[PDB]
Ligand binder design. Structure first.
Ligand SMILES: *CC(=O)N1CCN(C(C)=O)CC1
Ligand SMILES: *CC(=O)N1CCN(C(C)=O)CC1
Lengths: 304, 304
């Protein structure tokens, strides 16, 4: 019993973190096989970041300007290319600690672990979601860019996030491992506002199921609702519309608990309309939306 | 910017997790050098757990009854001993992945990471505190005992917790790595109630500092207080009494933010007396008490 915001074990990714230095800019790279992936802004001064022309900045850079250090051993860079907003540095040594891995571009509402790194050194691991506005609410200081987000399925690491940007509102933007930003963000120091932070309704319902499974049941009520009625309430409270797809995804938790998805929707509806009245659910005083249905099933069943 | 509940990277500990099986009981062991540490209740059936005599149960067990498996390779057990509530199994192979490590018995209020494991396989990592009642609020299913709690200082893992027990109230009890329970708990299936879950006042103040550092300042007020006055309010709200030691520990965060500890106490006092009025602090709707001052400094400075 007990339900906790849980990151994947980080060991497989710790073995991939390197330090990348270009001139006086140091940040993190991801070493998989004989390629090191890092944010292209490694080639910028802080001055450059106001309006960088990355293609033009990169022409002044050679293989030997990319200093790549794995712990205390330097890697030889034998090639470099820009793919969207990442650099790929070809090194002469395959990372012996390369796990089975994929690159996946996640959807908003999907959760992942972040291994926060500075100078290619892991500092900590926490769990995030891709917000509906394509920001993440991370913990990133200067030197943390090139830190990556990942899921693990048994032995395969799916890398979904590389850290690039803080918005002036203190939220985070980054790319998949093909260097494409999540959302409309750019690697430029300009006016970039996050859109509405909508709540991930399917994840809240997943977490309400988690609560029931672990004994927190005070918020169960005698009511039911419809997708259309619930969605009127979701609209009012900046919740993502609930779809039949979301209902289908909640089916297994529905089945295990014997609480119909639409009944749990009616519970959530009452929580939205009435607040928690100073009570808590799984030790939270607000509605948690960074557990996916898959996260709840994983944690509630003990998958490794 | 951003402040997140952050676990240590788990890689160094992942390399220490093994499966221990005795008869039909499987749980986790910790392999450091040529010793595997596991809960002594590995020798129990669920029936035994009502009133086990561990010394008597252990007499029926030989080295060859302790099946120890590191991934897919079996370790040869060449000796076994009971130390308090843990077994130490001597194996013929030093764990090649043994990190620099210490065994430390933490104090209530101290935080640590847990690598949740099943069958010697890591499932996830989350951050805990030793509660003032010597429980922890974990996420542990059957098969998770022998999972360990740890801090990392640069390269040295300090192991402080091994998981043993769920109380019927869904909170967790365990031992340090000398097999001594935190609090008055025993490895027996009996009536064991947790005492008062008091809030770790120094950790809440640490987290209020973290908030100010990261831009959440609405709860700062024009008031100050005294240790004695604050403690009257702490008493009323089941908060640990604040000591001069706690004030001294908050000094660096005091210094960095320029907010006197006693002024932040007065902010906390008003939060206790008035609640958050539907507002949030670092994305929480309650007062977080599982960041230590050391945790706030670590995360706010980017230590690795
Ligand atoms: C020095 C510099 O230009 N930096 C430091 C490394 N980063 C990040 C994003 O952490 C870029 C800015
Ligand atoms: C089968 C059995 O007796 N078990 C399973 C392993 N554990 C724990 C504590 O996870 C003990 C009970």
């Amino acid at each position: 019993s007990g339900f906790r915001k849980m990151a994947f074990p980080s060991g497989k990714v710790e073995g991939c973190m390197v330090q990348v230095t270009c001139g006086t800019t140091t940040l993190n790279g991801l070493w998989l096989d004989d390629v090191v992936y890092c944010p292209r802004h490694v080639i910028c001064t802080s001055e450059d970041m106001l309006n960088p022309n990355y293609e033009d900045l990169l022409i002044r850079k050679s293989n030997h300007n990319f200093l790549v250090q794995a712990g205390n051993v330097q890697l030889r860079v034998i090639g470099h290319s820009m793919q969207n907003c990442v650099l790929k540095l070809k090194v002469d040594t395959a990372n012996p600690k390369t796990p089975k891995y994929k690159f996946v571009r996640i959807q908003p509402g999907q959760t992942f672990s972040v291994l926060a790194c500075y100078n290619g050194s892991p500092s900590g691991v926490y769990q995030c979601a891709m917000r509906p506005n394509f920001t993440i609410k991370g913990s990133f200081l200067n030197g943390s860019c090139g830190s990556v987000g990942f899921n693990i399925d048994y032995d395969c690491v799916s890398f979904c996030y590389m850290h690039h940007m803080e918005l002036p509102t203190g939220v985070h933007a980054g790319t998949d491992l093909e260097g494409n930003f999540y959302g409309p963000f750019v690697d430029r120091q300009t006016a970039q506002a996050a859109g509405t932070d909508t709540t991930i309704t399917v994840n809240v319902l997943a977490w309400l199921y988690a609560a029931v499974i672990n004994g927190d049941r005070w918020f169960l009520n005698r009511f039911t609702t419809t997708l259309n009625d619930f969605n009127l309430v979701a609209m009012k409270y900046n919740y993502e519309p609930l779809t039949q797809d979301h209902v289908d995804i909640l089916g297994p938790l529905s089945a295990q608990t014997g609480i119909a998805v639409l009944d749990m929707c009616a519970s959530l509806k009452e929580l939205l309309q009435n607040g928690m009245n100073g009570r808590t659910i799984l030790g939270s005083a607000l509605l948690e939306d960074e557990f996916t249905p898959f996260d709840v099933v994983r944690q509630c069943s003990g998958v490794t």
